[PDB]
Write a protein that binds this ligand. Structure first.
Ligand code: HEM
Ligand code: NA
Length: 250
């Protein structure tokens, strides 16, 4: 909503479609879906609505942005995609990385997140420090997702569910381990685990836990744990919005 998507040529659209297929095979084979989803979200999550700066505009490939502490390990993601990107010179890096995130959700069994091409690659990375801090709580989440990005409380909880795939690594964030028993399967297990309490072998970040105690976030955790279809619907909505921050009249 509020979006006017740009026209791209037929050749551009053809390349999107071909790149989508190549990304499915590559991501599935390399077992890197969680890392690609992180790459897409960290690219998008820097958007500040008040200044219209940052966002999903290809800047995460910049050595300067990769160097941000919140981006530890994403240099691997960028390197992994470079040979594929080279097969699609017509596409912006901006579009390619968001497409990789959409594909990451799909190949792990998640919802089909709508994708619209046309993001332009911007020259300057945003300032460091805009991405969410895992050690903080509900006020912080609203500052970053709501005040900066312009997303809703519903979008915050749904997007937190992205942790249903993947794991933290002690050499990247310092945190360690998967949120779920099935880290390459996209489902509502993140919320199920968040509710059941701490289980050995599984991770919960303070930021994950903050969902449980917030008056608005908690009913959403409950809904998603009870209804995976509702989670998938809200997740697809939220991911689309995230992937489109600052893009197509924002
Ligand atoms: C809600 C606020 C968030 C916080 C505090 C947060 C924090 C973190 C941290 C600390 C890690 C571990 C990085 C590492 O050590 O490898 C991580 C990983 C991850 N994040 Fe988030 N994140 C948030 C939101 C999101 C969103 C919105 C998405 C996408 C929708 C997402 C997707 C992922 C995925 C898939 C991984 C696992 C990556 C892998 O397996 O290598 N996260 N997150
Ligand atoms: Na899972």
């Amino acid at each position: 909503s509020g979006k006017s998507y740009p026209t791209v040529s037929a050749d551009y659209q053809k390349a999107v479609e071909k790149a989508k297929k190549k990304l499915r095979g590559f991501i599935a084979e390399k077992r890197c879906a969680p890392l690609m989803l992180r790459l897409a979200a960290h690219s998008a999550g820097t958007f500040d609505k008040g200044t219209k700066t940052g966002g999903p505009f290809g800047t995460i490939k910049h050595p300067a942005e990769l160097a941000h502490s919140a981006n530890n390990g994403l240099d691997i993601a960028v390197r992994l995609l470079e040979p594929l990107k080279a097969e699609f010179p017509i596409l912006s890096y901006a579009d390619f990385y968001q497409l990789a995130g959409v594909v990451a959700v799909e190949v792990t069994g998640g919802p089909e997140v709508p994708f619209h091409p046309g993001r332009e690659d911007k020259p300057e990375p945003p300032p460091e420090g805009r991405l969410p801090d895992a050690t903080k709580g509900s006020d912080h989440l609203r500052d970053v997702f709501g005040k900066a990005m312009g997303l809703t409380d519903q979008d915050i909880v749904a997007l937190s569910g992205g942790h249903t795939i993947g794991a933290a690594h002690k050499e990247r964030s310092g945190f360690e381990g998967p949120w779920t028993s099935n880290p390459l399967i996209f489902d509502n297990s993140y919320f199920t685990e968040l509710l059941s309490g701490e289980k050995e072998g599984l991770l919960q970040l303070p930021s994950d836990k903050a969902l449980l105690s917030d008056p608005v976030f908690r009913p959403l955790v409950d809904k998603y744990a009870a209804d995976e279809d509702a989670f998938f619907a809200d997740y697809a909505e939220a991911h689309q919005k995230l992937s489109e921050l600052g893009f197509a009249d924002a």
